[PDB]
């Protein structure tokens, strides 16, 4: 998965240097979605996944799969 930084939808230069693609799954009782992100560091997916369950408001059992790179936030 590749990422643009210039926000024209294609990639060139170090948006090819490899991304990941993650998908984040939001379980909650009041808010339940699901949704997807690449970023080139999971430290980065990651500052945005926690950054989206919380703009859920949503807290519990966070649990991720390497297996597909996949996050779930149980309440």
């Not at 799954?25 to 970023?39: D, M, R, Y």
């Not at 649990?63 to 149980?74: E, G, I, M, N, S």
């Amino acid at each position: 998965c590749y990422v643009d930084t210039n926000n024209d939808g294609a990639y060139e230069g170090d948006e090819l240097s490899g991304t990941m693609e993650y998908k984040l799954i939001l379980n909650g009782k009041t808010l339940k979605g699901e949704t997807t992100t690449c970023a080139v560091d999971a430290a980065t997916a990651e500052k945005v996944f926690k950054q989206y369950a919380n703009d859920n408001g949503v807290d519990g059992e966070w649990t991720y799969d390497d297996a597909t790179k996949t996050f779930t936030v149980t309440e």
